[PDB]
Structure formats: structure tokens, C-alpha cells
Design an enzyme around this catalytic site. Structure first.
Site, PDB file in Angstrom:
ATOM      1  N   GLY A  11       0.792  -1.212   0.000  1.00  0.00           N
ATOM      2  CA  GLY A  11       0.000   0.000   0.000  1.00  0.00           C
ATOM      3  C   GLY A  11       0.832   1.272   0.000  1.00  0.00           C
ATOM      4  O   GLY A  11       2.041   1.247   0.201  1.00  0.00           O
ATOM      5  N   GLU A  12       0.165   2.390  -0.268  1.00  0.00           N
ATOM      6  CA  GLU A  12       0.815   3.686  -0.297  1.00  0.00           C
ATOM      7  C   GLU A  12       0.797   4.262   1.100  1.00  0.00           C
ATOM      8  O   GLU A  12      -0.152   4.053   1.853  1.00  0.00           O
ATOM      9  CB  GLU A  12       0.077   4.622  -1.241  1.00  0.00           C
ATOM     10  CG  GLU A  12       0.232   4.291  -2.727  1.00  0.00           C
ATOM     11  CD  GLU A  12       0.527   5.538  -3.542  1.00  0.00           C
ATOM     12  OE1 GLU A  12       1.421   6.308  -3.108  1.00  0.00           O
ATOM     13  OE2 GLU A  12      -0.132   5.761  -4.591  1.00  0.00           O
ATOM     14  N   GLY A  13       1.857   4.968   1.458  1.00  0.00           N
ATOM     15  CA  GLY A  13       1.941   5.560   2.785  1.00  0.00           C
ATOM     16  C   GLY A  13       1.971   7.072   2.677  1.00  0.00           C
ATOM     17  O   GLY A  13       1.842   7.604   1.580  1.00  0.00           O
ATOM     18  N   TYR A  15       4.561   9.260   3.134  1.00  0.00           N
ATOM     19  CA  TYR A  15       5.731   9.679   2.378  1.00  0.00           C
ATOM     20  C   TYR A  15       6.335   8.597   1.501  1.00  0.00           C
ATOM     21  O   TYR A  15       7.544   8.581   1.306  1.00  0.00           O
ATOM     22  CB  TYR A  15       6.795  10.260   3.312  1.00  0.00           C
ATOM     23  CG  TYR A  15       6.265  11.390   4.147  1.00  0.00           C
ATOM     24  CD1 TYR A  15       6.196  12.687   3.635  1.00  0.00           C
ATOM     25  CD2 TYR A  15       5.728  11.148   5.418  1.00  0.00           C
ATOM     26  CE1 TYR A  15       5.591  13.718   4.363  1.00  0.00           C
ATOM     27  CE2 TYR A  15       5.125  12.162   6.155  1.00  0.00           C
ATOM     28  CZ  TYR A  15       5.054  13.447   5.623  1.00  0.00           C
ATOM     29  OH  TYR A  15       4.420  14.449   6.341  1.00  0.00           O
ATOM     30  N   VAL A  18       4.828   1.145   0.265  1.00  0.00           N
ATOM     31  CA  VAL A  18       5.237   0.043   1.101  1.00  0.00           C
ATOM     32  C   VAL A  18       5.030  -1.245   0.362  1.00  0.00           C
ATOM     33  O   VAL A  18       4.047  -1.415  -0.322  1.00  0.00           O
ATOM     34  CB  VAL A  18       4.448   0.019   2.445  1.00  0.00           C
ATOM     35  CG1 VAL A  18       5.125  -0.992   3.481  1.00  0.00           C
ATOM     36  CG2 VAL A  18       4.432   1.448   3.058  1.00  0.00           C
ATOM     37  N   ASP A  75      -4.367  -5.217   8.100  1.00  0.00           N
ATOM     38  CA  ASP A  75      -4.682  -3.832   8.526  1.00  0.00           C
ATOM     39  C   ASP A  75      -6.162  -3.808   8.973  1.00  0.00           C
ATOM     40  O   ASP A  75      -6.986  -4.676   8.560  1.00  0.00           O
ATOM     41  CB  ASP A  75      -4.427  -2.830   7.390  1.00  0.00           C
ATOM     42  CG  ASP A  75      -5.456  -2.934   6.271  1.00  0.00           C
ATOM     43  OD1 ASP A  75      -6.307  -2.032   6.128  1.00  0.00           O
ATOM     44  OD2 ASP A  75      -5.437  -3.942   5.545  1.00  0.00           O
ATOM     45  N   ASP A 116      -1.360  11.241  11.197  1.00  0.00           N
ATOM     46  CA  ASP A 116      -2.212  10.795  10.087  1.00  0.00           C
ATOM     47  C   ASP A 116      -2.887   9.451  10.396  1.00  0.00           C
ATOM     48  O   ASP A 116      -2.926   8.593   9.530  1.00  0.00           O
ATOM     49  CB  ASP A 116      -1.375  10.682   8.801  1.00  0.00           C
ATOM     50  CG  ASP A 116      -2.233  10.626   7.536  1.00  0.00           C
ATOM     51  OD1 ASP A 116      -3.429  11.033   7.587  1.00  0.00           O
ATOM     52  OD2 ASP A 116      -1.724  10.152   6.495  1.00  0.00           O
ATOM     53  N   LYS A 118      -5.337   6.416  10.670  1.00  0.00           N
ATOM     54  CA  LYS A 118      -6.460   5.939   9.868  1.00  0.00           C
ATOM     55  C   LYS A 118      -6.457   4.436   9.900  1.00  0.00           C
ATOM     56  O   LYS A 118      -5.444   3.825  10.218  1.00  0.00           O
ATOM     57  CB  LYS A 118      -6.499   6.473   8.421  1.00  0.00           C
ATOM     58  CG  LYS A 118      -5.347   6.248   7.582  1.00  0.00           C
ATOM     59  CD  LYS A 118      -5.235   7.399   6.569  1.00  0.00           C
ATOM     60  CE  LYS A 118      -3.834   7.358   5.973  1.00  0.00           C
ATOM     61  NZ  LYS A 118      -3.510   8.446   5.024  1.00  0.00           N
TER      62      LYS A 118
HETATM   63  O1  LIG Z   1       2.899  -4.650   8.067  1.00  0.00           O
HETATM   64  C1  LIG Z   1       1.939  -4.278   7.364  1.00  0.00           C
HETATM   65  N1  LIG Z   1       0.934  -5.073   7.021  1.00  0.00           N
HETATM   66  C2  LIG Z   1      -0.088  -4.691   6.166  1.00  0.00           C
HETATM   67  C3  LIG Z   1      -0.910  -5.528   5.487  1.00  0.00           C
HETATM   68  C4  LIG Z   1      -1.763  -4.688   4.741  1.00  0.00           C
HETATM   69  C5  LIG Z   1      -2.847  -5.125   3.784  1.00  0.00           C
HETATM   70  C6  LIG Z   1      -3.496  -4.022   2.921  1.00  0.00           C
HETATM   71  C7  LIG Z   1      -4.645  -4.796   2.183  1.00  0.00           C
HETATM   72  C8  LIG Z   1      -4.801  -6.124   2.990  1.00  0.00           C
HETATM   73  N2  LIG Z   1      -3.949  -5.939   4.211  1.00  0.00           N
HETATM   74  N3  LIG Z   1      -1.427  -3.385   4.996  1.00  0.00           N
HETATM   75  N4  LIG Z   1      -0.407  -3.390   5.871  1.00  0.00           N
HETATM   76  N5  LIG Z   1       1.850  -3.006   6.955  1.00  0.00           N
HETATM   77  C9  LIG Z   1       2.740  -1.897   7.186  1.00  0.00           C
HETATM   78  C10 LIG Z   1       3.990  -2.186   7.822  1.00  0.00           C
HETATM   79  C11 LIG Z   1       4.947  -1.176   8.069  1.00  0.00           C
HETATM   80  C12 LIG Z   1       4.692   0.180   7.681  1.00  0.00           C
HETATM   81  C13 LIG Z   1       3.452   0.484   7.060  1.00  0.00           C
HETATM   82  C14 LIG Z   1       2.463  -0.550   6.812  1.00  0.00           C
HETATM   83  C15 LIG Z   1       1.234   0.157   6.154  1.00  0.00           C
HETATM   84  C16 LIG Z   1       0.755  -0.059   4.731  1.00  0.00           C
HETATM   85  C17 LIG Z   1       0.129   1.275   4.372  1.00  0.00           C
HETATM   86  C18 LIG Z   1       1.073   2.331   4.996  1.00  0.00           C
HETATM   87  N6  LIG Z   1       1.690   1.559   6.066  1.00  0.00           N
HETATM   88  C19 LIG Z   1       2.952   1.802   6.566  1.00  0.00           C
HETATM   89  O2  LIG Z   1       3.582   2.876   6.621  1.00  0.00           O
END
Ligand SMILES: O=C(Nc1cc([C@@H]2CCCN2)[nH]n1)Nc1cccc2c1[C@@H]1CCCN1C2=O
Length: 273
Positions: A11-13, A15, A18, A75, A116, A118
Site C-alpha cells: 500500500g501507499e503511505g 511519504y 510500502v 490492517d 495521520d 487511519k
Molecule cells: O505490516 C503491514 N501489514 C499490512 C498488510 C496490509 C494489507 C493491505 C490490504 C490487505 N492488508 N497493509 N499493511 N503493513 C505496514 C507495515 C509497516 C509500515 C506500514 C504498513 C502500512 C501499509 C500502508 C502504509 N503503512 C505503513 O507505513
């Protein structure tokens, strides 16, 4: 970097993007974030807590920056979408809120704001834990505190409490509390529910940079209409997270001792994969 093999885009973060990746050197599956500082980031590396996604490594190479985080199973947004027919059970909502407050109280005591929050960046595992991600780095507007919308630039830790209030409400009703589509529409959806604020409930509000005397004046609705069927302890904690004035908003540490949490437990979620 050449030590990683990307399996897919996670997914997009805020900055950067990911990816789920495997680290050849360790064989561990990891969350790899490619950014677009060095010092502010190395500090985060030492910010460890059970309810904060762990920052494993920082790779600043060839004038590029990649942050390597632990990977977390799922998530909260995906979990909420999958349970929108029956809703997340209350014991679980309460566990998640309580653990979220613990991580926020810990970050807040180190003077680190999230900014941020969510559902997409709240991460949950198979064992009932939940973790804050996309943190201390510093577009959906739905969880933005009104002081940011009114153009305040020196906001406090209270912006995170507000966002957490919004999420708490969404988990209960299975509908986003203030799903605005532009900054002004966002502000107006908040005013329409909580009342247009004034100097009485929020001293200094008419002095915010983007405040306009021409804002329509709406009356505040009762929270019993807003979050059915949340109980009175839950509603009262929620109203305190959603106070307009940031100085009156409940802090994370104080919310941990609220009566809503008297009966918290840590149930195990039912999650698909
Ligand atoms: O460790 C995870 N696991 C997951 C799994 C999922 C997915 C998304 C669709 C299904 N589940 N998102 N994240 N995510 C993770 C780990 C470290 C840093 C970040 C994230 C999330 C993704 C969006 C921005 N985020 C970050 O900055």
C-alpha cells in the site's frame, strides 16, 4: 536494495510506497517502505513498544532512503470491511482502543505525534494485538482534527486523540463519522454534527488562520443519535476525544483509566487469510 526481494505492493503511505518483501540475509518477511530526516528517523529506530510497528533497519543508499519494518499480518480497514455485515464485536473494539491508547500514550510521552491515523495504518495480528504504523515520519481527510483544517501549524498530540475518536466511532457504527471529500466539506460535516464552534466552546477559534466569520451556524446533535448503540461510558469517553478545543481533549494516558475500560479483556479476533 539488492538484499530484498519484493513479493507485492502492500500500500501507499504518507511519504512513500510500502511493499511486502523478503530479506535474503535473514529470510524474514518484512514491510519495505521506499521514501519519496536521517537524524529524526534514527531516533524512531529506538522507539520500541508492543503497540508500535517495529522499525527494523534504515537503508540510506545511493542517495535513496528505504525504511525496513516488521511485517504485520493485516490492517484494520480490511478487517472492518470484512466484518461490515455483523460488525466488530464490542469486546474486541474495546481491546483495540485500549491497546491503541497505550501506544499513543507511549509515543506522546516521547513527544512523537502520529498526525495521520487511519484504519489503513492500524495493523492487527492473529493474536489480538494491534499496532500503530506510518508514524513519526512527518488524500483521506476523514480523520483530520479541526485545528489542522482551520490552518493551525503548531498542533499538539491532541490531533491523534481526535483521529482515534473518529476511528472508534466508525468501528461501532460501521460508517465513517465525517467522510468529507474536500477540506471545506470536511469542516462542514464536523460542524453539522458537533455544532459550529465559537469562542465559548473553543477560546481562540475565531483567530485561526482559515477561520471565516461567514461559516454557517449549525446546532450540535446528541451523541446518542451519532453512535448508537454505544453505551453511556463509551459515549462519554468518545465526547471527550472529540472536544473541539485541543486543550480540553482527553489525553491518551487519562483515557486509559476511563470507566469504559473497567471490563477490557484481550479476545482473539476471527480473521481470514
Ligand atoms: O505490516 C503491514 N501489514 C499490512 C498488510 C496490509 C494489507 C493491505 C490490504 C490487505 N492488508 N497493509 N499493511 N503493513 C505496514 C507495515 C509497516 C509500515 C506500514 C504498513 C502500512 C501499509 C500502508 C502504509 N503503512 C505503513 O507505513
Amino acid at each position: 536494495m539488492e538484499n530484498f526481494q519484493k513479493v507485492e505492493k502492500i500500500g501507499e503511505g504518507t511519504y512513500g510506497v510500502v511493499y511486502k518483501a523478503r530479506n535474503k540475509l535473514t529470510g524474514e518477511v518484512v514491510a519495505l517502505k521506499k521514501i519519496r530526516a536521517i537524524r529524526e528517523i534514527s531516533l524512531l529506530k529506538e522507539l520500541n513498544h508492543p503497540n508500535i510497528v517495529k522499525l527494523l533497519d534504515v537503508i540510506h543508499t545511493e542517495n535513496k532512503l528505504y525504511l525496513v519494518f516488521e511485517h504485520v499480518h493485516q490492517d484494520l480497514k480490511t478487517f472492518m470491511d470484512a466484518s461490515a455485515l455483523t460488525g466488530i464485536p464490542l469486546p474486541l473494539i474495546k481491546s483495540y482502543l485500549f491497546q491503541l491508547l497505550q501506544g499513543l500514550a507511549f509515543c506522546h510521552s516521547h513527544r512523537v505525534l502520529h498526525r495521520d491515523l487511519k484504519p489503513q495504518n492500524l495493523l492487527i495480528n492473529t493474536e489480538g494485538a494491534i499496532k500503530l504504523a506510518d508514524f513519526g515520519l512527518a488524500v483521506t481527510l476523514w480523520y483530520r482534527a479541526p485545528e489542522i483544517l482551520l490552518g493551525c501549524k503548531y498542533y499538539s498530540t491532541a490531533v491523534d486523540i481526535w483521529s482515534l475518536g473518529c476511528i472508534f466511532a466508525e468501528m461501532v457504527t460501521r460508517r465513517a463519522l465525517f467522510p468529507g471529500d474536500s477540506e471545506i466539506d470536511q469542516l462542514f460535516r464536523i460542524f453539522r454534527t458537533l455544532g459550529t464552534p465559537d469562542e465559548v466552546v473553543w477560546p481562540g477559534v475565531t483567530s485561526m488562520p482559515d477561520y471565516k466569520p461567514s461559516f454557517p451556524k449549525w446546532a450540535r446533535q446528541d451523541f446518542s443519535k451519532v453512535v448508537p448503540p454505544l453505551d453511556e461510558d463509551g459515549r462519554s469517553l468518545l465526547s471527550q476525544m472529540l472536544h473541539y478545543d485541543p486543550n480540553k481533549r482527553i489525553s491518551a494516558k487519562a483515557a486509559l483509566a476511563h470507566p469504559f475500560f473497567q471490563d477490557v479483556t484481550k479476545p482473539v479476533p476471527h480473521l481470514r487469510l
